[PDB]
Design a protein around this ligand. Structure first.
Ligand SMILES: O=C(O)CNC(=O)C(=O)O
Ligand SMILES: [Mg+2]
Ligand code: NI
Ligand SMILES: [Zn+2]
Length: 331
């Protein structure tokens, strides 16, 4: 078995190897990359996403989210308080202000220490989940707006045509902005490109050990767990690396820098934080190997998780027994 310790793997495809996206994912999996739940892909030196980032300041962040924490430094939840609209240029200025800017630090490990010590005492503002793309239309390789759609993949594998569309999302971050522990909708893959700015640190649990994280989460968030049998789908719970190690949960960590891709694999729980002002693009995708994960994915039916239009058909076709309950949760 390749990669039996479930380490995060880093790949350096050549320009030739960068042509065929699906082929390269399958190659990474042949080397055991999926066992980690997360891989890094450094693009060939000949590649670029677009020419410059000089003209992005007028993008609108219609609903910036202030991420308010509750709990203790290593075990907390966050809620999202909606703020007034602002442009990317306004948000960048806010991220760089004394109130929000990254503190002085020695290296990524020192900043990580500071994050986990102090995150809860601040409420950073996250420009998350903005439909759109920063890839140039002329970028032919690894262009996250030109991937094969998940509806086409399901149709190809299973023979059933379904409604729905699959488009990317932009994330404008600042110091301490946080993504809570989660797997993707329907335990899909994700791919994330860090277009510009400061790094993003990731934590990940191997898919074969995801249920160990779920059991810890139920213990640590006992009210949330009574409320919903899949409450990590709410995307509000944080647990630090120190707490995971104390509880024997297998995990890994890595820092993504501008110009790098990350891929999350089906049922790979992940969480993390941004170092300072940045902009990432991400989208979900599927392969043949995903179908079995999609058929077994948990679902939230309590009402909280509320998701896109396109998840309806995935539940309907892959999980017909669960469909009626899940849809009630949507309504
Ligand atoms: O960048 C973020 O805030 C969150 N991203 C992801 O969870 C992802 O790309 O799968
Ligand atoms: Mg602009
Ligand atoms: Ni994700
Ligand atoms: Zn729920």
């Amino acid at each position: 078995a390749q990669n039996p310790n479930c380490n995060i793997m880093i790949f350096h495809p050549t320009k030739e190897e960068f042509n065929d996206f699906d082929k390269y994912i399958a190659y990474m999996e042949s080397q055991g990359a999926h066992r980690a739940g997360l891989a890094k892909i450094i693009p060939p030196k000949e590649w670029k996403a677009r020419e410059t980032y000089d003209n992005i300041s007028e993008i609108l962040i219609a609903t910036p989210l202030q991420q308010v924490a509750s709990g203790r430094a290593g075990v907390f939840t966050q809620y999202h308080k909606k703020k007034k609209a602002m442009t990317v240029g306004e948000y960048r200025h806010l991220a760089n202000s004394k109130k929000y800017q990254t503190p002085p630090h020695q290296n990524f490990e020192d900043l990580e220490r500071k994050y986990w010590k102090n995150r809860i005492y601040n409420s950073p503002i996250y420009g998350a989940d903005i439909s759109g793309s920063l890839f140039d239309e002329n970028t032919k390789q690894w262009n996250l707006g030109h991937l094969g759609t998940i509806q086409d993949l399901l149709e190809k594998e299973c023979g059933v045509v379904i409604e729905g569309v699959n488009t990317p999302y932009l994330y404008f971050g600042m110091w301490k902005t946080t993504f809570a522990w989660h797997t993707e909708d329907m335990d899909l893959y994700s791919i994330n490109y860090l277009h510009l700015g400061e790094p993003k640190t990731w934590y990940v649990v191997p898919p074969e050990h995801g249920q160990r994280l779920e059991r810890l989460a139920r213990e640590l968030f006992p009210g949330s767990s009574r409320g919903c049998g899949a409450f990590l789908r709410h995307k509000v719970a944080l647990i630090s690396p120190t707490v995971l190690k104390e509880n024997g949960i297998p995990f890994n960590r890595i820092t993504q820098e501008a110009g790098e891709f990350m891929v999350t694999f089906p049922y790979g729980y992940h969480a993390g934080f941004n170092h300072g002002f940045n902009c990432a693009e991400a989208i979900n995708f599927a392969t043949p190997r995903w179908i079995d994960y999609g058929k077994m994915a948990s679902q939230c039916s309590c009402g909280e998780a509320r998701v896109t239009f396109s998840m309806d058909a995935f539940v309907r076709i892959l999980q017909p027994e669960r469909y009626d309950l899940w849809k009630r949760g949507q309504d």
